[PDB]
């Protein structure tokens, strides 16, 4: 029967089906009642997801007419051997999603309860990951920033620098012309401004190398956040979806309109 | 790059009032000044030099005249100051330095560079540095259509000029809605013709009883009809003198459109006002027009075998990887997944390389794909992530993405890719579970601290390039019932995300030909094709060739990350350049700017498209502007938004002082709520108040927030910062309520005040997207014949989480207005005495039904009494839509489409005119009618907006980031079911919501 049949998934959707279905090989299929209310076969070929219609006509199947098989167990069951290469060219209906393989906890009360735990754990790993990422990007952002301001640092020192090389082109002249005409004085007096200059660009140099350091750290605990992020994202999606596991079959058990 | 800070220096918000500046004179010498923060550079300039001649070697200056002055700005950028009437604290430096040099090169140039630049947010002079030929080549080669549109803005100089800056604000049929015709007496319009009359400034009002399909000029004419059959000809000259402008705003009637085809006339007529226009002459207007030159840049100025000849099956190689971020005590190995994609379509299984350790990241590793080289189509792409396996509980393994990229198998010229390759990998989208990211960006990330991947492409002894339309179109002509009919029409109208079998793309790829006949089949038919075959995608070429056009609702689906195709793509833009009303340009301006993002090269016809439109209609330039800038710090769209604004920028005329202004005023709102945010985030409202007006009151604050363009609304002319009625918001994030005078002349037929909130902190974007949708929903509605009157005010998204929100005046919410379940009937009979009083209740009945039907269908956000609010008027007004779609599944896996506005008995009390058994009345009957209308009516326009939440899914947005979040609108408006069982299936919604009452 096709009731007891474990690829057949009665009412289930094509955005489940899809997730069933991602990452598997060729020749991955599973039955289904159609997108209306009459099956639909899902199978897996080139990377995609192939929906093809399960035709039925006075107690007859098949997926063009003639329509040749007596049942849907019979079809999926001849094409489970035979293969779809001969109809349109390719695969055949090898890896079934079973329905049976995937863990029935006794009773009602005993569900709920530890849905109740999974639900729990699952909201306090969400707002674990969720604080996680407001820091992922809050870091991600910051740093950023610093990397822009290294570069405006590095431009400032371009400027200051040009600018001693300035002092030194013209000065040296002028203070030849200044020993001559024994004006020690103004000599004192270039020689004042320089070293004011420079004392600027060292003040200039080291708030780079603070800004520089700031950002060592900083990448390094960017790197630490997402080794962090890349551990509790895996665990986070299969946590919620034991969860909504739990939330499917206190609904298929209970009272259903 | 953009400036990290919104202060006045870098770590500094504000400049204290006087600050030290140390100036680099051109002697060598170095001079601290004490700046007063505000002085303009023309006196800093002239207070150093004054100075200069106590220090030494001031013998080598030259007038201060001959120079200006030079520094680092905060986009680390060695920006020189020719505008010296520019103060010291609007100048984004990094330090407080200022170095004088003599002013070298292209002066006119270097300042439009700077005006571009600062538009942008970006210094010009970054997209110079690129090496990629590509970003080049579009620099030089979009110039054309620059060129293009100020030529024709140039034809008929005064009025092409006028019908850029102040295009029609037309709708896209001049045929009224029946519904709306009966609101004319015996089909006319009474509109008021108001003249301010030289030499004394008063008034005067020319009542006019005229036919509403009068184009101005006849509005013109029978204006002077009245004022003043011997004088038919002094009309017939005297016409061509004056033009009609709309009461309170920069609004101009200035093409031959019946009057009621415009929309301030259509809405005057609806909401049954008075159209007060003022006449105005040509000559008045023409003046103030200036002429506007584009000019050529500086970089404007400066400097085989095909792919069906490879006889072999497509190969990459897999080199190395530099880091990855991830512990070892967690996972076990790392590899690169691979993916070759049409779109979002694998053209072949995905391959995988094999397990290494993270800590040795090589593979040298062949990876073979079922795909022939000559098989590849055109958009073929590789899409390829590093993930982490560990597979430590259970058989079960867990695989999760550390870092994607994804490479165009061809570059923007056809050559097929060759030899080796560096990319540098993007960080996984939040929320994006799966392991590739096709809908992702093509290209390396910028950021080069980033895991680097080295790939080797083959070599075939010469350069492949992908074949030439003829040869492709020789090898289509190679390689060639009534209950038929019938199945063609059914799919043809199936909404764009329905199911289709492979006996339906059998049957549609088999019947190719016959199509032709209903052309609204295209994009079905188009995922009939085989794209992993040569043969068929040839044949399709042949067929989209000659295709006939299509609607352009119907076009943009082809512009998704669904088609990929270059032909498809260019069949797409040509129905838009045909058949698309700048209405409804302006109206999906959101998504086409979108899709933009889906494009695999920077030069494409849809750039094209809409730059041109942007450039020959100021309205749509404006948002074009606004939508691409609020996307500049978004490092995976930076680029090629920078560049497409930059071509914006150099043509978009005078508009860009405009622009200028906005984004000057904008930053400086910024600066000011940056410092609420952080520096006095633990402050008291009065004295957070205190703070505010002091800042305000400011003459450089003055300057750049008083008399610039409203950022939502070109038209809306924003006056003088009324301070007084300036307030920050109790709430969340802590809006800036703002409030300027409307500088309009009879600005009192209006409004006076024009009211906007300035959030920042939330991202506006899904906001934005709700309204816009909400929008689209009324037109549907209006032009149906329903008068479901909502209140879609405007909400604009200016950058990284900040954005402007239309304030809604005379608006209360329903908690505030409980201050007893009779209290908001009360109110609102208190507030509409007397007769009005069937107006206002029509009025909240209407708004009810379509807030009631639109927040159903797109699942907003749960609504409260302080999410809904209610006009004077009657009108009902929702705010705050932060989520939409299936939000609510992931946090709690509930499978259930809600009702998020359950009518209270305080709705339906207000329905019933304060009736007891309230769901038993006439007046609610007709309530469930007008929704039962409404849904309906957008259950007809489905496909309208599957496709624009489809054209969507690369922005960002937290609630759609897949076509599973749009499967959430396929279960409200029950799509898989008939109109009968849809209209059923609402029904019993509303029946379990509001615990019965809705009768068939
Ligand atoms: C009478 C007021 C009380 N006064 C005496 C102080 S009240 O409290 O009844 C009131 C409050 C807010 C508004 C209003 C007007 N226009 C708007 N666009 C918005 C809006 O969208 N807000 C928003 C908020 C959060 C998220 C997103 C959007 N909110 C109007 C009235």
Redesign the pocket.
Known sequence: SLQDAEWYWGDISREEVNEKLRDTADGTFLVRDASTKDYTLTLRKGGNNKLIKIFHRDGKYGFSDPLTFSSVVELINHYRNESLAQYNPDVKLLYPVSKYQQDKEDNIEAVGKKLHEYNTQFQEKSREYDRLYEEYTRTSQEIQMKRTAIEAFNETIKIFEEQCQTQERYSKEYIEKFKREGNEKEIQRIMHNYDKLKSRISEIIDSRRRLEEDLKKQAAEYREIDKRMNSIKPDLIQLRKTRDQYLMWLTQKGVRQ | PPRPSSGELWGIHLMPPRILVECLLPNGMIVTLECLREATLITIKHELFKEARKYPLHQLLQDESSYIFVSVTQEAEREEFFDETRRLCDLRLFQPFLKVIEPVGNREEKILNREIGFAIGMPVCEFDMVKDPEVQDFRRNILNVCKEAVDLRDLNSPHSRAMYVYPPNVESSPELPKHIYNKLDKGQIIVVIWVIVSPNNDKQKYTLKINHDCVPEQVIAEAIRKKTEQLKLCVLEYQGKYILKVCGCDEYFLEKYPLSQYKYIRSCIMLGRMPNLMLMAKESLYSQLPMDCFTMPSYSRRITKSLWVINSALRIKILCATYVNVNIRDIDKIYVRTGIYHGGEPLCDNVNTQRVPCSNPRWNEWLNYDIYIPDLPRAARLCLSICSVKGRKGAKEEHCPLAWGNINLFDYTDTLVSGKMALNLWPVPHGLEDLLNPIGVTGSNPNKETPCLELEFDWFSSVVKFPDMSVIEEHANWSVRENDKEQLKAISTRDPLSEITEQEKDFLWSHRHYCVTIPEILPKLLLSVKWNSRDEVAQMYCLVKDWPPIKPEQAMELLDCNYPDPMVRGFAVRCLEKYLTDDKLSQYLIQLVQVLKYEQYLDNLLVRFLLKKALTNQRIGHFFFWHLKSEMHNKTVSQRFGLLLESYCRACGMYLKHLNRQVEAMEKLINLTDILKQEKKDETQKVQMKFLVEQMRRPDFMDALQGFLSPLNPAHQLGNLRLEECEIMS??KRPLKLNWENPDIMSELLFQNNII?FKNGDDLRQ?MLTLQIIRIMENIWQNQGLDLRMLP?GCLSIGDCVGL????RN???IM?IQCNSHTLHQWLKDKNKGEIYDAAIDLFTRSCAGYCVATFILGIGDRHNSNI?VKDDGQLVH??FGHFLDHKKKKFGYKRERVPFVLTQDFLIVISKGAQECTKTREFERFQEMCYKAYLAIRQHANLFINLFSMMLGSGMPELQSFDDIAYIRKTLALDKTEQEALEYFMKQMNDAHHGGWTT
Request: no cysteine; proline share 0%.
């Open positions: 709430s969340a909130m906001d005010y929100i239309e304030w809604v608006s209360h919410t505030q609010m705010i705050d």
